[PDB]
Amino acid sequence: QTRHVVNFHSRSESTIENFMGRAACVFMDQYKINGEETSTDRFAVWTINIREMAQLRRKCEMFTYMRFDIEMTMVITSCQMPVLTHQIMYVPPGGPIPAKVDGYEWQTSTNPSVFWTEGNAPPRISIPFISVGNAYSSFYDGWSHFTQDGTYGYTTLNAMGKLYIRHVNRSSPHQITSTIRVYFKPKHIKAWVPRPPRLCPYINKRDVNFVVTEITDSRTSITD
Amino acid sequence: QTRHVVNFHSRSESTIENFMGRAACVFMDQYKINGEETSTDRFAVWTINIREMAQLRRKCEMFTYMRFDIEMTMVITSCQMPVLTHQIMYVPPGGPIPAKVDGYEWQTSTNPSVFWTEGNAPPRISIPFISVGNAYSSFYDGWSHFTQDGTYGYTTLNAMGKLYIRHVNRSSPHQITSTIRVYFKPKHIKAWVPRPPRLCPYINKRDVNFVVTEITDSRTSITD
Amino acid sequence: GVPVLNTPGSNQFLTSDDYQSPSAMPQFDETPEMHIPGEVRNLMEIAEVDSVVPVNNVTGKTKSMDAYQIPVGDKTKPIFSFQMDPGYSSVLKRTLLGEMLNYYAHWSGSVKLTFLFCGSAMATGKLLISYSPPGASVPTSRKDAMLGTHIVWDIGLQSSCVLCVPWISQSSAGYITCWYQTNIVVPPGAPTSCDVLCFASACNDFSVRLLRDTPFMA
Amino acid sequence: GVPVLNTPGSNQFLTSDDYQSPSAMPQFDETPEMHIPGEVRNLMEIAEVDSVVPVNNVTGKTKSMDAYQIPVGDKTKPIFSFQMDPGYSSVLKRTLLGEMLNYYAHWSGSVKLTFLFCGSAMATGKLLISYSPPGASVPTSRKDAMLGTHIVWDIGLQSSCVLCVPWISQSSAGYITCWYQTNIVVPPGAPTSCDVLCFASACNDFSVRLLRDTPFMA
Amino acid sequence: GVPVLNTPGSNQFLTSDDYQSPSAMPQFDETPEMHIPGEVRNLMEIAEVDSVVPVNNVTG
Amino acid sequence: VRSMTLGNSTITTQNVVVGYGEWPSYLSTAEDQPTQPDVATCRFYTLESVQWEKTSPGWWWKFPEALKNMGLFGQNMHYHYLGRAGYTIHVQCNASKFHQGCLLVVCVPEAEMGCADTDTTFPATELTTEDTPHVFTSDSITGKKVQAAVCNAGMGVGVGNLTIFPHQWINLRTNNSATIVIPYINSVPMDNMFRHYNFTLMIIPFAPLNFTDGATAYVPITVTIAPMYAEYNGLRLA
């Protein structure tokens, strides 16, 4: 490459909606169709949070507070029959969860769910700003239980819900193993209180713990 | 045939947009679905450039500088099951590339990709004028590395990106061999500095090297 | 919602369509357009540029620059002669005129020819440039060329004579022959043998319809 | 009803689209927006904030806060020197400026540097801060740095000298060297060795185009 | 976007329809129409022309 | 007869082909600021005269760096890494009245030339020898250098229809002088003057020189370049 005259004047790509509002795959999971009537491998879960993969997690930690609608579009495949129909049930933060693929929670009228049959365009489900407070908090320097009990750093304001996914087909002659890819996207996003970027690598998906990392890459002397 | 009175007055078909803006197939490639977990035959590449086939390449060399949006539509087939879903990932000039069909680059939020499932209309993805300069240069009489180093004739301004294509299905019982045909089309095209047409045949797809060819077809005498 | 019904031609891919392609990079704002000199807004602006025509393209003189040179300096046989059609003619097929016309099947217009005499400033003679209509036969003699359309081009006065040949179209053409009216008269100091360059472009305006692939590329 | 026909690109999932997503909770009315202090409406509002630049990032002083301290108090070799480009430079790549610029491929603008002298209130000396253009070679001596662009920064008068380096873009950069014009003159009570902190931000306005993934995260 | 629903009769091919066919050659501009003598604008302009009637159409 | 002068360089001249109908001009930002030299730079830089014999096939110069050793313009190329200019190019021929011939004086922006034996490149000293011109050849050549055969000048095009560019014919019957103004054709407003050759002044004899046994056996072609509206990057702070 060579250093060219990069002559233009634009910061439309540096706004918050043009920086955060990009769809990224945040959840791959397998789920079968038949066998093991009491099993946990016939549906998917994915509690919705921004701390899924470190590439997106890093961008949400530029800012302390942010509020945004989310608009996820699943991409569902299958392996190994009839034409298959799926169900992507979003439960709110206050919502019952299934324990099995044939639980009664799947029939709850307050849990919105899409019934996508195979071959069409991917299913898209949009979720508004659910939180109780006025913004989602990326960081919470505080304790969930009063009087400095356990569970540091986890507030219940930035709870977004869960996403239970299953086949609606009751059975099949052979085994069908479906794969789902959830494409998370922030929408109509506002952000408050900027914050310095992450320096150290991430350890765990529910905490801010880190190993002490060097500031920059080292060089030989101060003058070279 | 016979010489008829070709009586009309029109040059609407001779404008630049009615001369260059025509869809032409520029990339056939095969890519499997299963086997050889570390292989290069499970995805396609095609670094996007105008110097693909000599019929289109000749038209872009009428003009020194040109700028245009590109709007390619893939035509994907299959041979040998479930319903198949594909992924056509366009990486920008500044973008990470996959090394394997299961690399992490495929999940990059800054690489836009279409997820076309089989049976529908062909997938269409449109790419704006990416280049750093103010036009794409068909010819570059210059050196990439300063002080007359290697790599003559290749500027980094006329870099358009790449186009990684794979199946999103993780596996299959039997072998499925998909074929993709990328239909490149210039759009909203402007062109500067006309240039004489190519006379000699093309040798290689990254240079202007040629064999000395005769000017016209010869005849017997000057007067016949 | 709105009751729609898909017509025949839905979910197909017609290669030549002009539909709104969904942009892959919507946030991306492209580089501002500066003014670059020499914009082309129409292909027929290339055909209107004069360019040298290889009239002397005989069997051994096409890989050198002796193809462009018409030797001047026998009065019974013409100097040169060629079909007047920029397509399917060895002389006018690789001209800027004749090369932007092989991208098209239907074209019709006129074509102007400039004969630049590249001899000495002391050489003096006359050349008779005859034109045959597209149906007529070529003149076999100088007198029979004089009785048709011609221009007795005095070299000693003007050194560049311009034609404009009409009725040039395809979808059996004219002839531009040239004759020795007089020999080249030359003083003792100047050389005896001279050259004549030729040129070709679109005369006033050129019409062209049906785009195709060029035959030259393989 | 209405005769429609599906174009190429129907029933596909382009990752970067801006279509109206059907809302899953339509009855649900979201919480009213209160005013929270410190809203960000543009990323380049983070790049305009000064932040300390680890100039002394030598091989053993990068996990401590000795990376940020330029030791002041040999006049033949410069105090410090570094490439002037916030990308691909060890000194300016983890700055707030240099970290919001690694999210992008095309960026262009200027960058201002503040040198805060953190010595005593009685120490007095001169430092010569030279700037080399992006094509030029570094000054090997203090005189050759004086003949180019420089600012003889008197420490005893002002304790903070501000630059503004233009022509900073990528899609071979400048140099900010610093020289002992004079030694640090100090009374008997004050200490002899001092430190100089550095800062960096966007000078007036900064241009930045093509978003990408950052290299630091693995 | 716009909520549409396909009626019965979608994705069929009725032989006698008058829909907007997508043109294969959009750039192409057709030849201008000259005036040719003797235009027919209705078939019953042929029936109004007298013509000889074979009344004596006996067997030979 | 007009005696033009620029700075401390006066030539004697005897119609101008303004390239692409535009006269060179300046670029008109505090993030990037150009420096306009004006002083010197604009004077006439007469190259070495070139003898045109009966067997000369042609010449080419590659600018802007053909002037890389020419005074202040060739010295501002080493201190600034960005620039642009206009290059008024006079081409006299000062032949006699008994000489005959014809030249094509054409400028050819972005003349990317091809190697002589393809599958390889050339060592970068074959495109340009600063002031002196690389000649063409009459037939094909081999070796790691530029395919300099006329009829395929450098680029694999026909040499006859090289008239599409800013050109001027020098027919010794009528005229002797040519002048071309080339208003900095490039896709970026400023570019480095050592990497990129903005255009290629090539002089190609279509009708060959001819004379009798008493005249001088050559005709010296004189090339003169005036870099107009040259502006560079800024070296000062902001």
Residue numbers in the entry:
A (entry chain D), B (entry chain A): 1043 to 1122, 1132 to 1275
C (entry chain C), D (entry chain F): 3001 to 3073, 3078 to 3175, 3187 to 3233
E (entry chain O): 3001 to 3060
F (entry chain B): 2013 to 2026, 2030 to 2043, 2048 to 2257
Q: What did the authors write?
A:
Viruses from the family Picornaviridae form non-enveloped icosahedral virions that are about 30 nm in diameter.
Specifically, we performed cryo-EM of echovirus 18 virions exposed to pH 6.0 for 10 min, mimicking the acidic environment that the virus encounters in endosomes. Asymmetric reconstruction combined with 3D classification identified subpopulations of echovirus 18 particles that lacked up to three pentamers of capsid protein protomers. Reconstructions of the open particles missing one, two, or three pentamers with imposed five-fold, two-fold, and three-fold symmetries, respectively, were determined to resolutions of 3.8, 4.1, and 3.7 Å, which allowed their molecular structures to be built. Except for the missing pentamers, the open particles are similar in structure to that of the activated echovirus 18 particle: increased diameter relative to the native virus, reduced inter-pentamer contacts, absence of VP4 subunits, and holes along icosahedral two-fold symmetry axes. The capsid proteins next to the missing pentamers are more mobile than the rest of the capsid, as indicated by the three times higher temperature factors than the remainder of the capsid.
